[PDB]
Amino acid sequence: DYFLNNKHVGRNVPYSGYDCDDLSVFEMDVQSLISREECLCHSMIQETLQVMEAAPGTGLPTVGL
Amino acid sequence: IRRYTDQRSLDRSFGLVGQSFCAALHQELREYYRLLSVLHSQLQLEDDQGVNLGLESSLTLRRLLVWTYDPKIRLKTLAALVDHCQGRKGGELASAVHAYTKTGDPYMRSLVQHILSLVSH
Amino acid sequence: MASSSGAGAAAAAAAANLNAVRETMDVLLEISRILNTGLDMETLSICVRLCEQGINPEALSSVIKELRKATEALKAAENMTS
Amino acid sequence: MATPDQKSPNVLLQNLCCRILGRSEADVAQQFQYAVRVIGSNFAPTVERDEFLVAEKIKKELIRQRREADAALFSELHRKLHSQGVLKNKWSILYLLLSLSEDPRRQPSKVSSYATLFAQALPRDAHST
Amino acid sequence: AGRQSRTFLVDPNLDLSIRELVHRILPVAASYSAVTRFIEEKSSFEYGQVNHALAAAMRTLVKEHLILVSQLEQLHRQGLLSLQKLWFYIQPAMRTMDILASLATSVDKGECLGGSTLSLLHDRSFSYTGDSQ
Secondary structure, three states: OOOOOOOOOOOOOOOOOOOOHHHHHHHHHHHHHHHHHHHHHHHHHHHHHHHHOOOOOOOOOOOOO | OHHHHHHHHOOHHHHHHHHHHHHHHHHHHHHHHHHHHHHHHHHHHHHHHOOOOOOOOOOOHHHHHHHHHHHHHHHHHHHHHHHHHOOOOHHHHHHHHHHHHOOOOHHHHHHHHHHHHHHHO | OOOHHHHHHHHHHHHHHHHHHHHHHHHHHHHHHHOOOOOOHHHHHHHHHHHHOOOOHHHHHHHHHHHHHHHHHHHHHHHHHO | OOOOOOOOHHHHHHHHHHHHHOOOHHHHHHHHHHHHHHHHOOOOOOOOOOHHHHHHHHHHHHHHOOOHHHHHHHHHHHHHHHHOOOOOOHHHHHHHHHHHOOOOOOOOOOOOOOOOOOOOOOOOOOOOO | OOOOOOOOOOOOOOOHHHHHHHHHHHHHHHHHHHHHHHHHHHOOHHHHHHHHHHHHHHHHHHHHHHHHHHHHHHHHHOOOOOHHHHHHHHHHHHHHHHHHHHHHHHHHHHOOOOHHHHHHHHHHHHHOOOOOO
8 A cells, every 4th residue: 555655654753763674575575476476477378388288189178079 | 974973073162062963963874874784784695695586685786776765865864954054053053953844754854853852852 | 122222212312301401490490599580480481482482582581571560460450459 | 291392372372371370361361462462573683692691691680789609600500501402592591581580689679770781782683684 | 858758769770669669668767767857856845845745755656666676677687577578567567657757747737836736636636536556
């Protein structure tokens, strides 16, 4: 939420250091999100190729038809 | 900033209020240097570990820029405050600090409020 | 006949470890007594298990202090209600 | 016949609360909840796992209590503890004991002043936990 | 040139299709540069506390954008980033930056300040009634 990560957007901002521990956590979260999108892409690719990769005449839903 | 701090730390004529302001500046500088040291330690860990760990500690130009974006704003605020307080002392120094307290930036506002309260105590 | 020697030695090692843990806990209790910490054997053992279980030492110390304050408040409330 | 095994924090906290308050867990639910809330978000990356600092602090406290002999005894106990390989987080155990230590002088019935010094310890925060 | 959006020069020896893809992507970077310029300009105390707060919020969103860019840089360091994946990943980022840049440009053109800025914010919020994000 735009307001949730708005640490420096506030009326009564407590005096804090420059400690970016939350920033590192947010960076890790964004990296996880990107990695999740990439992993989803790779899994979808693998599934689609694997469907396309079945042996000729194998994997057909109408077995024997 | 460091030149200013060294210039004013030696001036006994800055008086108790000036000394308190310099002390507060030194404390904030210590916090900034601690943050810089932590970031440096993370970059050094990334260099020493030899692994291209895509961790936030890996020395990217972008990772450095990201970690210093807020530090850049902080340092800009501190430098502007130092410039604005140049030549002011005593009640004039207090007035200069109060004038800088009127900033709209909540992070700058918080920092300046803490510094103002500490120096005014 | 071969297999029984291993289980007996393992059991003896476990018993020795238990005795060593007991000795260590006794030493800790003595240290607390000299330091007048006020912890009992069951509480000390629980704390030892918690620290052994990975509790953060700053967190563990703060939690212990808070728990001690809460226990003292509860004992004071029990003495005030009695 | 109990073998040491990692039990959930809830069980340990429940037993601890029961023994500290001397009441059933139902009678300490509010306190249990408060303690659980505070404890549940507390990891110490800033604590330096160094027994030497804790030992030095204990020695200084004993000296403050005019208990140099007790300090020597504590040192011997720490030496014996180091001889035993039962504890792995000795720094944590020592910190906990020192924090929960209550001064018998506070011998006497009070302690002279509390001019805490900058001496303290390390912040360990420097590492990327 | 002046208060114009940043323009880019592409090497003439680049692939025409590559050049067109670059020209399609470049709008996001132009928006970023304009936003940074706006943030730096309206961040002066003379622009008032409301403009300062606006700049701070913009700074937070710019930080998020920079985080995204840094993650993309990390993926590139792995050699795992293709142009189509880049375009796909930036499309939401492109739209977000374009919305932010349009709001910035509207505020700057209107020189909105204080209550006029709040009115402009209300009008923009109604203007973004169709974009839930």
